[PDB]
């Protein structure tokens, strides 16, 4: 108790048992939904499971993260495109 | 946008690509939270106070 | 490994860089174009080679992409 | 015999232009090939 | 309150009244002006205007 | 009361006080989350 | 899609880019709802009935 909180010394355990394999993204979506539902209960601090290994959401796992990283590849290719444009100008001079 | 959603610890949406299921970190994690045949998953719950 | 693009102006080959992170999953990604007839990239995660690609021809350009590592 | 050397001296300029165009074409091919292959690698299995 | 929807002259009168209210330091301490600012003017005014 | 609703003449005020500067997008996400939570309470018309 | 989400007043997600924090409208708004040092934010709540 000098370092942790009291609740971490007496945690609870819940198991959800199905009949089919759950190691695919489609079932991971439902697992995350269940984890959020459990966390939203009044009086619960945090829930850790496969989608929240350390109790916090996995980084780089939101849809807006995927959206916000969509344009980095175009930024990476910029130099090689600028070189092509300069080559176009020099080719025009050669034509002259 | 990506940095903001990471810093805020937002959890409105979630998605894990199939390629992440082959990394060693998630290979170890699925042996820590899921049954050997993958039919069950366990949750750890911590109260307040 | 923070998910931001970085660039190197022009450096003599061979070139190497080592990065470290604590995140469960990252997306290594790199491109390179040289003045030689052959160029190769290689990505190593925890002393394991994840990707290696070679391009051939004048002013060859290559890339190494790993979706999750 | 004075006109012929002029025609001889005209030629070299055009060949240099063709060589530069060939170099530009090779560089453009490399750049666009890399871009297309990179995009196809990233977009593969994205409908998952 | 007005018989007709409040217009430019209403805003001028409102601004003058707000300035004079802020002048009286002894009684008035703070006036949060939402109708003056365009970002929040929608809330401070009724639907009929 | 002829134009507005009764509740607009007697509003409530809530303040959330932290120790760090909050004028960045990352904190604005949490502020919007709090605003939605307050609005979803039964009996609340709007939060600004 | 954009017009549909604007007309319906949808609020499932939210994001404000860093560039918006420099506009005068949000420069005024942050002096209207946040403390001068930016450590606190106030909310206005209106009941029903």
Q: Report how far residue A3's alpha carbon sits from residue A5's, in angstroms, rounded to the nearest whole number.
A: 7
Summary count for chain C: helices (H), strands (E): 0, 4
Specify whether the CB–CB gap between A22 and B39 falls below 8 A. Answer: yes
Supply angle C-alpha A60, D44, D28, rounded to 5.
Answer: 105
Question: What are φ and ψ of residue E7, in 5° steps?
Answer: -115, -145
Specify whether the CB–CB gap between B9 and A57 falls below 8 A. Answer: yes
Contact B30 A15 (CB under 8 A): no
Contact E46 F3 (CB under 8 A): yes
Residue with token string 């060939």? D22
Q: Residue C46 has what DSSP assignment?
A: T
Q: Report how far residue E32's alpha carbon sits from residue G44's, in angstroms, rounded to the nearest whole number.
A: 12
Name the 3-class secondary structure at D13.
Answer: helix
Q: Report how far residue A38's alpha carbon sits from residue A57's, in angstroms, rounded to the nearest whole number.
A: 14
Specify whether the CB–CB gap between B20 and B26 falls below 8 A. Answer: yes
Q: Which two tokens stand for residue B38?
A: 């993958």
CB contact E38 to G (< 8 Å): yes
Q: Report how far residue A30's alpha carbon sits from residue D45's, in angstroms, rounded to the nearest whole number.
A: 21
Q: Report how far residue C6's alpha carbon sits from residue A27's, in angstroms, rounded to the nearest whole number.
A: 36
Q: How far is CA D20 from CA A74, A89, C61, E16, in A?
A: 27, 12, 19, 74
Nearest to F34 by CA among G44, A61, B49: G44
Q: Report how far residue E48's alpha carbon sits from residue E18's, in angstroms, rounded to the nearest whole number.
A: 23
Name the 3-class secondary structure at A52.
Answer: strand
Specify whether the CB–CB gap between D28 and D21 falls below 8 A. Answer: no
* Burial of residue F39, with CB atoms counted within 10 A of its CB: 0-12 exposed, 13-18 middle, 19 or more buried: middle
Resolution to 1 decimal, in Å? 2.8
Q: How remote is the C-alpha of C12 from its chain's centroid?
A: 15
Specify whether the CB–CB gap between C64 and C51 falls below 8 A. Answer: yes
Substitution target from C4, C27, C67 for chain B, most B beta carbons within 10 A: C67
Q: Which two tokens stand for residue C55?
A: 């391009």
Q: Report how far residue A77's alpha carbon sits from residue C67's, in angstroms, rounded to the nearest whole number.
A: 18
Nearest CA distance, G48 vs chain B (angstrom): 28
Partner residue opposite A72 with nearest CB, options C5, C23, C24: C5
Q: Residue F25 has what DSSP assignment?
A: H
Q: Which two tokens stand for residue A59?
A: 């980084």
Q: Report how far residue B15's alpha carbon sits from residue G24's, in angstroms, rounded to the nearest whole number.
A: 37
Q: Name residue G47's beta-bridge partners.
A: F44
Strands ordered across the beta sheet of F12-17: F12-17, G40-47, F44-47
Q: Which two tokens stand for residue C6?
A: 């970085």
Specify whether the CB–CB gap between E34 and E44 falls below 8 A. Answer: yes
CB pairs under 8 A between F and G: 81
Specify whether the CB–CB gap between C27 and C69 falls below 8 A. Answer: yes
Q: Report how far residue F7's alpha carbon sits from residue F47's, in angstroms, rounded to the nearest whole number.
A: 12
Q: Report how far residue A38's alpha carbon sits from residue G11's, in angstroms, rounded to the nearest whole number.
A: 23
Question: For the stretch G18-27, what's the b/e string if a residue is b when 16 or more beta carbons lie within 10 angstroms of its beta carbon?
Answer: eeeeeeeeee
Which distant-in-sequence residues (6+ apart) come within 8 Å of D36 by Cβ?
Answer: none
Specify whether the CB–CB gap between C68 and C27 falls below 8 A. Answer: yes
Q: Which helix (H) or strand (E) holds A48?
A: strand A44-48
Rg (CA), chain C: 13
Specify whether the CB–CB gap between A28 and A51 falls below 8 A. Answer: yes
Q: Which two tokens stand for residue C32?
A: 């390179």
Mark the breaks in chain G: residue after which each occurs, C to N over 2.5 Å: none
Contact A63 B49 (CB under 8 A): no
Q: Residue D45 has what DSSP assignment?
A: T
Q: Report how far residue C69's alpha carbon sits from residue F20's, in angstroms, rounded to the nearest whole number.
A: 35
């Amino acid at each position: 108790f000098r370092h942790f909180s009291q609740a971490k010394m007496n945690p609870d355990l819940m198991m959800v048992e199905t009949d089919r394999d759950l190691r695919n993204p489609a079932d991971f979506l439902v697992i995350d939904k269940i984890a959020k539902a459990l966390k939203n209960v009044h009086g619960i601090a945090q829930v850790q499971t496969i989608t929240r290994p350390d109790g916090d959401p996995i980084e780089h796992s939101t849809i807006p993260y995927t959206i916000g990283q969509s344009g980095t590849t175009q930024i990476m290719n910029n130099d090689y495109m600028q070189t092509n444009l300069d080559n176009l100008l020099k080719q025009a001079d050669d034509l002259q | 946008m990506s940095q903001a959603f990471d810093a805020a610890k937002n959890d409105d949406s979630f998605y894990l690509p199939p390629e992440a299921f082959e990394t060693d970190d998630f290979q170890r994690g699925m042996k820590l939270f899921m049954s050997p045949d993958g039919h069950a998953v366990r949750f750890t719950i911590i109260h307040q106070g | 490994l923070e998910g931001m693009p970085q660039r190197v102006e022009s450096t003599p080959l061979p070139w190497s860089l080592t990065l470290q992170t604590t995140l469960p999953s990252v997306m290594p990604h790199i491109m390179a174009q040289g003045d030689g007839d052959s160029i190769t990239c290689r990505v190593t995660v925890d002393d394991v080679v994840k990707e290696e690609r070679t391009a051939t021809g004048m002013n060859a350009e290559t890339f190494c992409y790993v979706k999750a590592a | 015999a004075d006109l012929m050397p002029r025609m001889v001296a005209v030629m070299p300029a055009q060949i240099q232009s063709m060589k530069n165009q060939k170099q530009t074409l090779l560089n453009q091919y490399q750049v666009q090939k890399a871009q297309q292959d990179q995009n196809m690698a990233m977009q593969e299995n994205a409908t998952a | 309150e007005g018989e007709e929807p409040l217009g430019i002259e209403a805003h001028a009168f409102y601004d003058k009244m707000v300035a004079d209210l802020r002048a009286d330091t002894e009684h008035v301490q703070h006036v949060q002006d939402f109708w003056g600012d365009t970002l929040t003017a929608s809330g401070a005014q009724s639907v009929d205007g």
